[PDB]
């Protein structure tokens, strides 16, 4: 009675979850745009009507791909640069006592040492200024990395500024984007669209604070893989930014020492004028309002009558303990102790000042045996940035106490990549299909 | 908005979605980063050639909507056309019948050769 016969259809709209390799799309720098495809001036997006998809930000291969690509680019950028192997020599250092305050005492060391020259016969005696975090006593001192590995000096012509990068899928695949506001990164998104490429993402490297990020369109958002478990980090996204102004006011001077044929080492000659600590400034009232919004949102998940505590970081390495970042090629580590210090109970123009310490020998990624030397920058440095998110970790969490304490977190940079690709997924099309029909060949 | 285009008919019914197969058909083809791009292009070309070969083996070469001689078994599906072509989406049907895919392919493949042999025999006379 049915007399139904099989029929083959090509081009059926069906997709399945899959993993593939995405490629560049962009409009001297570390993030090489030379080998990255030009971006279309008029990108196209197609809203899918009456289509609800499943999303989960904590199982995204895009984050891993981005991390691998960023690490590969960073490794590639440093290949054609000078290797500071001869620098591992016995230094003779003294304290700097020339126009310093009570907080910068012992921070700088004036060192002298012998070094090679272009000719392999002669030697030259030179001097330099080093930071206390870079020299370890063996009056005799040595570089911290000498007993681990010798790393290359970053070339002075490349720039560390982040450039937006768009990720595009290959032919036969598609990228689905969730346009549903108040979506918390896990569950069914009912509003979906297909996009040829991902919006511009700045690969900003920072810890304890998300800088120059994207802002929520509705209100403060809280995300976590398992909020009940304390071992899982909590990502907080603001709906408005907070301005932070970070400056190093020392007037540095750069000098070149010829250590070999076509090989120059850049050193800090001397500081002109006064010496004082670099520091950051953050608005107080804006920070208080942001923390009020954050605690209001946190009360939804962790009870209405609970006490919410913000305190200092537990401890560990300087990178995870302090807010680490860079400004104009100068690597800052700031002490964010005055911000996350307060208690909340259910019921003008002053600015918070964060002192910061500068570093030159850098191990950016969590790797051992590959450091990097940042050449000094000439003149004072200043910059302004937007705080648009936080990474928090719960302390304890046992049922014995009703007070919840949140502390700053960080360390793993994948989270910085997970705060931007939380509304994207990749699928592959399956055009072939079989159905019943009334035909007869 | 660009509601219609490529996958815009994903949420529509099968009857409505069958009218726009061409938009999906067109897009199936189109230093360290270059290697990844080349690998992706090679995989895409291989997938397209595999799909084209599978279509060709069944005798539906160069056709988007091609019916065949293999009859439909009621065991695989019991729903009638009344509640399928206008009361269901392609995604739902594919999810429902993802189990019973290969048998129909084999039946089509073995059916095509018999038709070819019969055509040769008829033309022999």
């Amino acid at each position, epitope marked *: 009675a049915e007399n139904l016969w099989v029929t083959v259809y090509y081009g059926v709209p069906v997709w399945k979850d899959a993993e593939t390799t995405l490629f560049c799309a962009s409009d001297h720098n570390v993030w090489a745009t030379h080998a990255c495809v030009p971006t279309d001036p008029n990108p196209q997006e197609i809203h899918l*009507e*009456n289509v609800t998809e499943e999303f989960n930000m904590w199982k995204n291969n895009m984050v891993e791909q981005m991390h691998t690509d960023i690490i590969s680019l960073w490794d590639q950028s440093l290949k054609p640069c000078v290797k500071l192997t001869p620098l591992c020599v016995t230094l003779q250092c003294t304290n700097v006592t020339n126009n310093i305050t009570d907080d910068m005492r012992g921070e700088l060391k004036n060192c002298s040492f012998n070094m090679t020259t272009e000719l392999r016969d002669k030697k030259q005696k030179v001097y330099s200024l080093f930071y206390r975090l870079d020299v370890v006593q063996i009056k005799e001192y040595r570089l911290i990395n000498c007993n681990t590995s010798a790393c290359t000096q970053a070339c002075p012509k490349v720039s560390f500024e982040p450039i937006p990068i768009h990720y595009c899928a290959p032919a036969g695949f598609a990228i689905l984007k969730c346009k549903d506001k108040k979506f918390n990164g896990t569950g069914p998104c009912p*509003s979906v669209s297909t996009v040829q490429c991902t919006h511009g993402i700045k690969p900003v490297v920072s810890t304890q604070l998300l800088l120059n990020g994207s802002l929520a369109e509705e209100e403060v958002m809280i995300r976590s893989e398992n909020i009940t478990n304390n071992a899982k980090n909590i990502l907080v996204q603001f709906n408005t930014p907070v301005q932070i102004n970070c400056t190093r006011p020392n007037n540095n001077t750069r000098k070149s020492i010829r250590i070999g044929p076509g090989q120059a080492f850049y050193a800090t000659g001397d500081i002109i004028g006064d010496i004082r600590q670099a520091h950051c400034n953050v608005s107080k009232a804006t920070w208080n309002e942001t923390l009020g919004k954050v605690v209001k949102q946190l009360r939804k998940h962790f009870g209405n009558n609970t006490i919410i505590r913000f305190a200092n970081s537990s401890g560990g390495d300087l990178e995870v303990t302090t807010h680490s970042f860079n400004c104009g090629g100068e690597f800052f580590y700031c002490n964010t102790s005055g911000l996350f210090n307060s208690t909340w109970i259910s019921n003008s123009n002053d600015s918070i000042t964060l002192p910061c310490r500068i570093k030159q020998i850098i191990n950016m990624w969590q790797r051992i045996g590959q450091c990097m030397y940042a050449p000094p920058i000439q003149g004072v440095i200043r910059c302004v940035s937007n705080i648009t998110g936080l990474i928090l970790t719960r302390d304890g969490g046992s049922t014995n106490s009703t007070t919840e304490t949140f502390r700053p977190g960080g360390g793993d940079m994948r989270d910085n990549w997970r705060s931007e690709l939380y509304k994207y997924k990749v699928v592959k099309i399956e055009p072939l299909g079989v159905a019943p029909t009334r035909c007869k060949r | 908005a660009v509601f219609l285009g490529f996958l815009g008919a994903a949420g529509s*019914t099968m009857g*409505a979605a069958s009218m726009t197969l061409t938009v999906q058909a067109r897009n199936l083809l189109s230093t360290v980063w270059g290697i990844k791009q080349l690998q992706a292009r090679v995989l895409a070309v291989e997938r397209y050639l595999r799909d084209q070969q599978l279509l060709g083996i069944w005798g539906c070469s160069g056709k988007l909507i091609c019916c065949t001689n293999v009859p439909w078994n009621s065991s695989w599906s019991n729903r009638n056309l009344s509640e399928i072509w*206008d*009361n269901m989406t392609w995604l739902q049907w594919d999810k429902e019948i993802s189990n019973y895919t290969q048998i129909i392919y084999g039946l089509l493949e073995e059916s095509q050769n018999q038709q070819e042999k019969n055509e040769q025999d008829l033309l022999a006379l």
Partner: antibody
Amino acid sequence: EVHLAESGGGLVQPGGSLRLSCAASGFMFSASEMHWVRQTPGKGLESVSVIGGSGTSTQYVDSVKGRFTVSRDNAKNALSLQMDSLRAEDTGVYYCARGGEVRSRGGWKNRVLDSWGQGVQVIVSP
Amino acid sequence: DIQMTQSPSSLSASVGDRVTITCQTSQPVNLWVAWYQQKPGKAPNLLIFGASTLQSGVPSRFSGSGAGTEFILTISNLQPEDFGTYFCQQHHNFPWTFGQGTKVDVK
């Protein structure tokens, strides 16, 4: 053209009874669901009751459940609403509407009130 | 019963202005939401059904969109004949609840 005409409204005291009739033409009456809707003065629309094509399925809102009865005559293509124990809140304009089957752009079929009558006034005051 | 909430309650707009009316539901109703217009002393007239399909004969300026529990009616080019009370109705399950109505009048 679909035509619906209401009649039987007027003034009634609280606790009284009243019948509203709706004459329909221009379509297949037996194959269309019928809706009784009311609009109170100064308020929005509200669906009072619904009756199916066969006349066996009838539904009402909680505000009128147990007091309002909806019936249909397919032979005469007529619809009837009996109201009993009328209250002051029942005052307003009553419309008889047809739930017509329509096809969405995606290919799904549902029913909407695509045709309405002119309406009839009922005033429940002492 | 599913309750329907409209916004704004009332609005004053001039000829040629773009009018946007939002309608919200407590529970999902798929996309079975219909937008009607009412003039003074006249019965409601259907404009949108299915939350995105335009009724035959209606001018193209009227459009509808949305998903989940949020739907939007858009009048791109307000005309003298489009002033009145707009309502959004859900017809997924009985009872079919209407909105409180948005009144658009001449400024």
